[PDB]
Design a protein around this ligand. Sequence first.
Ligand SMILES: COc1cc([C@](O)(CCN(C)C)[C@@H](c2cc3cc(Br)ccc3nc2OC)c2cc(OC)nc(OC)c2OC)cc(OC)n1
Ligand SMILES: COc1cc([C@](O)(CCN(C)C)[C@@H](c2cc3cc(Br)ccc3nc2OC)c2cc(OC)nc(OC)c2OC)cc(OC)n1
Ligand SMILES: COc1cc([C@](O)(CCN(C)C)[C@@H](c2cc3cc(Br)ccc3nc2OC)c2cc(OC)nc(OC)c2OC)cc(OC)n1
Ligand SMILES: COc1cc([C@](O)(CCN(C)C)[C@@H](c2cc3cc(Br)ccc3nc2OC)c2cc(OC)nc(OC)c2OC)cc(OC)n1
Ligand SMILES: COc1cc([C@](O)(CCN(C)C)[C@@H](c2cc3cc(Br)ccc3nc2OC)c2cc(OC)nc(OC)c2OC)cc(OC)n1
Ligand SMILES: COc1cc([C@](O)(CCN(C)C)[C@@H](c2cc3cc(Br)ccc3nc2OC)c2cc(OC)nc(OC)c2OC)cc(OC)n1
Ligand SMILES: COc1cc([C@](O)(CCN(C)C)[C@@H](c2cc3cc(Br)ccc3nc2OC)c2cc(OC)nc(OC)c2OC)cc(OC)n1
Lengths: 50, 234, 117, 81, 81, 81, 81, 81, 81, 81, 81, 81, 34, 43
Amino acid sequence: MSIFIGQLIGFAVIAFIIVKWVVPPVRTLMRNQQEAVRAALAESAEAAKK
Amino acid sequence: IHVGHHTLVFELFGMTFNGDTILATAVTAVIVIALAFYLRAKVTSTGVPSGVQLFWEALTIQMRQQIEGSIGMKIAPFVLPLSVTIFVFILISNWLAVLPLQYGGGAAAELYKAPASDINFVLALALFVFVCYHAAGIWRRGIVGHPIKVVKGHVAFLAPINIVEELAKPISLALRLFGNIFAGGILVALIAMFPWYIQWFPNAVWKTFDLFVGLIQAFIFSLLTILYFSQSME
Amino acid sequence: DLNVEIVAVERELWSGPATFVFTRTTAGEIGILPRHIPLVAQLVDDAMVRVEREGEDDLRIAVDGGFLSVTEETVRILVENAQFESEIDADAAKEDAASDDERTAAWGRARLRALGQ
Amino acid sequence: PNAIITAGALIGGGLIMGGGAIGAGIGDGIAGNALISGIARQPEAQGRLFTPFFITVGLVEAAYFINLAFMALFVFATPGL
Amino acid sequence: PNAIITAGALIGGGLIMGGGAIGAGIGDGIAGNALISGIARQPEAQGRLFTPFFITVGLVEAAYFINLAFMALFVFATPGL
Amino acid sequence: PNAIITAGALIGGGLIMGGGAIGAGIGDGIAGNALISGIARQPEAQGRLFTPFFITVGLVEAAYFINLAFMALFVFATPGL
Amino acid sequence: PNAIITAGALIGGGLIMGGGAIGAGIGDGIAGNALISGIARQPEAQGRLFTPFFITVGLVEAAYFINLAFMALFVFATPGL
Amino acid sequence: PNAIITAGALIGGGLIMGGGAIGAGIGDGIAGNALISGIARQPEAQGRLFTPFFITVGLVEAAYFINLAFMALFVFATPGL
Amino acid sequence: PNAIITAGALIGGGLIMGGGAIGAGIGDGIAGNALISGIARQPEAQGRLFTPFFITVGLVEAAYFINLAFMALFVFATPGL
Amino acid sequence: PNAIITAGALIGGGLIMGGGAIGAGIGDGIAGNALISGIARQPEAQGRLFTPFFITVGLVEAAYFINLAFMALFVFATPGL
Amino acid sequence: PNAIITAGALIGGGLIMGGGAIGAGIGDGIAGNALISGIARQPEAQGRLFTPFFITVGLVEAAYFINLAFMALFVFATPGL
Amino acid sequence: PNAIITAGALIGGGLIMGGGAIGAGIGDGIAGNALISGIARQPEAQGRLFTPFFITVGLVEAAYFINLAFMALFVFATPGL
Amino acid sequence: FLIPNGTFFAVLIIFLIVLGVISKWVVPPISKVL
Amino acid sequence: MEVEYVGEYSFEPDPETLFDALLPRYIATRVYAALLEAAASES
Ligand SMILES: COc1cc([C@](O)(CCN(C)C)[C@@H](c2cc3cc(Br)ccc3nc2OC)c2cc(OC)nc(OC)c2OC)cc(OC)n1
Ligand SMILES: COc1cc([C@](O)(CCN(C)C)[C@@H](c2cc3cc(Br)ccc3nc2OC)c2cc(OC)nc(OC)c2OC)cc(OC)n1
Ligand SMILES: COc1cc([C@](O)(CCN(C)C)[C@@H](c2cc3cc(Br)ccc3nc2OC)c2cc(OC)nc(OC)c2OC)cc(OC)n1
Ligand SMILES: COc1cc([C@](O)(CCN(C)C)[C@@H](c2cc3cc(Br)ccc3nc2OC)c2cc(OC)nc(OC)c2OC)cc(OC)n1
Ligand SMILES: COc1cc([C@](O)(CCN(C)C)[C@@H](c2cc3cc(Br)ccc3nc2OC)c2cc(OC)nc(OC)c2OC)cc(OC)n1
Ligand SMILES: COc1cc([C@](O)(CCN(C)C)[C@@H](c2cc3cc(Br)ccc3nc2OC)c2cc(OC)nc(OC)c2OC)cc(OC)n1
Ligand SMILES: COc1cc([C@](O)(CCN(C)C)[C@@H](c2cc3cc(Br)ccc3nc2OC)c2cc(OC)nc(OC)c2OC)cc(OC)n1
């Protein structure tokens, strides 16, 4: 019982740390790559139009 | 600390099996299969990639760059799937241990124990990679040609050393992965001896960095697999 | 920001500010961003230079046996002969890269590297 | 019997912590030497140099932590008592 | 008799972890020193230096963690007992 | 019985201080070597060169302190005594 | 009497493995430092640098596992037991 | 009796002094290497350079003194006696 | 009585192999660092650099071998038994 | 009872001088490396290099001398005997 | 009596050879590193560098040989036995 | 009683020689590395450089010799007997 | 605990399955995507 | 060339090789300046 709770508090701390300092860079990184790929598709589309 | 002690142990075909390790490996396998199937359903060449598509694309690009930079992709097409699967398998195995699946017996028990903490898992992956790149060397050099190059290596008069380094390739590749995760399984157990009001701090700081440690270990395992292939093949 | 100036022996070639400069000196690859310690080095015979111009896109330059100097005031690239990526003749660079002459081959390979291979 | 095992555990934990301190201190010193030299070379790279630094410090300080854990196993939870 | 063997196993495991920690810390510090120096000289090399870095680390860490494994064998499953 | 435990604890604390001193001295020397070389190469960098230094020292001085604590635990509060 | 034999064998094997760990880790770090530095200076040299590197590491690793091969002989065979 | 405690205290203090000597000697030799190299490259810098030098030597020679403060504690006071 | 003699022989052989492993690993890593640096700075020089290398590794790996030999003499043919 | 303390004092003094000799030799080698390289590069500054050299050596030889002194105190005037 | 002295002599000779091997291997590595670097850099210097290299290697292997002789004295002509 | 003191003295003398060998070998290697590099880059300077080198080797060798002396004092003229 | 067991195969089999799936569901698909 | 000592940085590779590779460039630039100045004088 006590062990579970304490490791659950530890997991809550880990989740807070990753959400505050690890999630922002990675999610947004993937996000920037996403923007890039979509805009590249866009450039291809435009060139086709040209 | 009860180091060892696999639960769910059973016996079949006249040999013993650690049930808990098999369960953890199956959980990791189903997570990886779910990721693969979700990619397959939502893999888009023209549309905006999903999150899983970006993850798989980044991993495949990294491993393809590693292969191309060490042994041509024309020579080593079969090693990219091997690297990607090794990386994801080890990564998910290690990261699934970060979930709060640890409770108290009165010793500490853990519903999901990282499979790499068991010697069988890491030894299986290491020996599979060992057989795979030795078979690749045999294919690219010949049944009799490959052992001669393996013994000779790059310096002939260092023949015994090579024959050791070769045998060191699997062992280290296994044990390097074993001790890193096995050690963690002990730390979380050791940290369990603390009371709940101070247990969360060492546990949190350990597992937060264990995320990165498992990522680095999966990366190292895959990278050294690619490197050994490059070597054994030419 | 860096005061980056590229000075050919015949004339001053470029003087725009930049945020980052990049080149392969004879003793390895190097990058310079403002307030770098003073330095002197020799660019490889087939060297190329990337200037991370703050406003517009980066500038890629094929350089012929130049020298690199870093100073508290400016970053100078002394050049025997250089060409911006836009001025490079891709076919001519490809042909020169196979030239037997060491100087011509190095210059063509530098042009290819600056262009983007 | 417990006295001999406890003394051996104390000596083993002392070895664990001595080795951990040596490794962590010397590795941190070497990594910070690289960091100081780089920030001397190119101050503007300071922020870019803290990524490879904390990774390196992360790798040594992980080992130290493991060591500090196992000593705690030897000293307070002597496995073979 | 088991007390002496247990104390010897504790001392041996302490030696194993002391050596492993020294090697891990110092080798990781040296590899990270090379990494930080490279990223200082060429800040755009970060991407390409993590491959030869984690290879090196992968080698160095091996010496550590193999040792770690054997300490457990010394400590929890003492070869003689 | 307590005599054996106390002797082992003293040996372990001696090992802890020996390793801590080796690590602290060598790591601080390496970091100071970096700092001195950086200041010699360019004086004005001194102001910045003290931020990476006190960081590195903070890592190399922490390990020593940790050992300083545990030896103080080994001899004054010998666990398992 | 076998208890003393096993304790001595365990301490000797711990010394073997600790020395092997120190040598292997530090030597692998030293060689990988050269590898990383050479790749940082000349990325195209990557493939060229792995030939000598894996010779040197090949020796260093061979110093580790040979020692390991002997530690087993100390603890599982225990000559003179 | 406490003769075993005294022998253990002597061994521990010997370890303390040995580690302190290794750390101090090597660390201040590294710092002096930096000082000599800086003065050779800039013989007029000697004054400026003695500021960081005596800082790192202050850190390296502090670790020694503390160890000398504890070795004296071990053999003259022997807290566990 | 032999018990004690061969236990001491095991510890001494462990010391011999630990020192041999440390020396061989670190010396081979240093020689390999030099070889890799030379091949990176002078790609065409590799052919020449293997003669200075194997001489160096010849002197290094020789010591290890001797240690190994003597370890056998300590362990399988222990003097004074 | 005095035999045990005497053996412990002999081991402690051996450790003291082992550490002192390691620190002295390596620190003198490092400082002399600095001196030799600086004289090789800039001989005109040879004299200016001896002030920072003998200082560094003066520190190193202090650490050794102190240790030697304490070794005497351990072996001839064994505290607690 | 004889057994204790023989075991102590074996441990002392093991220490002698371990330290001698560490010193010999690391000194050979450090000297051959300079040899390889000089030859790489100045291939025509290969003949001129071998005189300094042989001086250094003589000084290092002289220490190794003296340690080997004294270990032989310890284990085959154990003084005080 | 004499057997215990003799075994302790043998262990202590082995420690002294191990430390002296490590320090002497590594310091000789470092000084010789400096000499070899300086003579590689300045062929005609070897004479100038042999002056500081023998000074360095003087301080290194000296320490070894002192150790070699005291080990004898430990082994043949055991202070505590 | 360092002695292998039957779980060895029980692991290898499972890994092979993943190696199969990623060999066809993932790599070639991501391959062609890129 | 005369060395002109007068009353009173980092180098890669070492300043001996860099100086040797630079001096011919110095002679080349001085000859170029001489040719340019000769052309100006000719005009
Ligand atoms: C007096 O201060 C300390 C500091 C520590 C450290 O270990 C570092 C010691 N070292 C520099 C020699 C430290 C640490 C832990 C790391 C673990 C991993 Br895995 C990977 C990297 C780490 N990096 C780390 O520092 C960079 C640490 C441990 C911890 O333990 C419950 N809680 C922490 O709170 C967040 C903590 O951060 C301050 C321990 C300690 O206890 C005796 N006292
Ligand atoms: C199976 O791998 C090995 C290799 C060795 C070595 O010792 C080197 C170990 N090292 C890399 C840490 C090795 C060796 C010996 C040398 C001796 C001198 Br003097 C000078 C240079 C040497 N260089 C050497 O290789 C670099 C060696 C030993 C040997 O045993 C009688 N027979 C050899 O020839 C057939 C032999 O050569 C290959 C030992 C060993 O034992 C467990 N297993
Ligand atoms: C000279 O007197 C001292 C000094 C110390 C130090 O350890 C440094 C020793 N070193 C240089 C080898 C020191 C210290 C501790 C640090 C801890 C961390 Br985490 C990170 C950085 C540190 N940097 C530190 O100084 C560089 C310290 C310790 C302490 O102990 C409760 N109280 C302090 O006062 C707040 C204190 O600061 C003065 C200890 C000591 O004890 C015998 N006597
Ligand atoms: C390979 O086999 C060996 C070699 C040795 C050496 O020690 C070197 C070992 N090392 C490389 C780690 C060697 C030696 C001794 C020196 C003594 C002084 Br002082 C100064 C320089 C020395 N340089 C030396 O060579 C580098 C030596 C010793 C000796 O007597 C025993 N007879 C010799 O002649 C045949 C002899 O030369 C070959 C010893 C040995 O013993 C088991 N087996
Ligand atoms: C040779 O004679 C000595 C010298 C010492 C020193 O430790 C230096 C030893 N080293 C060079 C290896 C020394 C010292 C102490 C420092 C403490 C701190 Br915190 C930070 C920097 C220090 N730097 C120091 O000098 C570099 C010292 C210590 C002390 O008390 C014992 N009293 C002193 O003043 C009368 C004193 O001289 C300032 C000790 C000693 O004891 C037997 N004999
Ligand atoms: C010939 O083999 C040797 C050599 C030694 C040396 O110690 C050096 C060993 N080293 C390589 C580790 C050596 C020595 C001593 C020095 C003492 C001082 Br203080 C300062 C500098 C020294 N430099 C020294 O050499 C550079 C020495 C000592 C000595 O005393 C008995 N008699 C000698 O004349 C025959 C003698 O040769 C000059 C010892 C030895 O003992 C078995 N056998
Ligand atoms: C065979 O000769 C020696 C030499 C020593 C030295 O310790 C050097 C040790 N080294 C070689 C590692 C040495 C010494 C002491 C220093 C003390 C301080 Br604080 C600061 C700098 C020092 N520099 C030192 O080197 C010159 C020394 C010691 C001493 O003993 C009271 N009397 C001396 O005067 C005659 C003396 O020479 C000034 C010791 C020794 O013991 C058997 N035998």
